[PDB]
Amino acid sequence: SSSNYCNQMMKSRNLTKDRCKPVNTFVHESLADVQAVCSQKNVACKNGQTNCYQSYSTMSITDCRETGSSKYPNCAYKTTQANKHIIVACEGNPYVPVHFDASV
Amino acid sequence: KETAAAKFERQHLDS
């Protein structure tokens, strides 16, 4: 875990303090705009449930993926920036995102 | 403790 954004943020957000998580996606949009996706395009989740929603527009995201040499305690990530549609599973009241299903 | 919504935010949101 070093200075690239992925190594830094994964550690800061308590994802890699006690393990190395293989992949994680960060969304660079306002919280309310991401929560707004729960009332957008309803789609089926990969698991078949129907509480998933796809964003009308693409969103700024950063994909973090472990390199093939990464090993606890020295997790290492490859950082990839992209703009894509996000698909989230929503639940509760208020109806908010609880899982990131995919990115298109 | 941490709710599922809170966890989603800590793990995926970077406004």
Side-chain angles (χ1 to χ4, degrees), chain A, chain B residues 1-12 14-15:
Chain A
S1 308
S2 300
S3 294
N4 75 56
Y5 171 90
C6 284
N7 289 178
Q8 304 169 2
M9 284 296 280
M10 291 289 277
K11 208 73 170 185
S12 175
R13 295 301 188 78
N14 188 202
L15 284 95
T16 57
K17 285 194 170 175
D18 56 13
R19 71 157 311 201
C20 290
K21 186 175 176 186
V23 307
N24 187 64
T25 300
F26 288 103
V27 186
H28 307 285
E29 301 289 342
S30 87
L31 182 50
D33 289 352
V34 172
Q35 293 171 325
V37 180
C38 291
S39 54
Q40 293 180 21
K41 186 61 173 185
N42 176 224
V43 297
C45 307
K46 304 186 185 309
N47 67 2
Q49 277 288 241
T50 50
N51 66 317
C52 281
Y53 295 80
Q54 181 170 137
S55 61
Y56 287 138
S57 58
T58 52
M59 295 183 166
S60 180
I61 75 155
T62 299
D63 298 86
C64 293
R65 181 170 294 254
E66 248 188 310
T67 61
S69 47
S70 179
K71 183 165 180 291
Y72 190 82
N74 313 293
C75 312
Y77 293 86
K78 174 181 183 177
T79 305
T80 307
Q81 174 68 215
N83 281 264
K84 52 210 298 214
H85 298 272
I86 68 166
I87 297 124
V88 296
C90 307
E91 297 175 358
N93 172 59
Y95 204 55
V96 292
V98 294
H99 289 298
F100 196 88
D101 203 64
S103 304
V104 185
Chain B
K1 194 55 185 65
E2 181 180 53
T3 64
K7 182 183 173 191
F8 177 85
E9 298 169 338
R10 165 177 63 79
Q11 298 194 297
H12 307 292
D14 183 25
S15 312

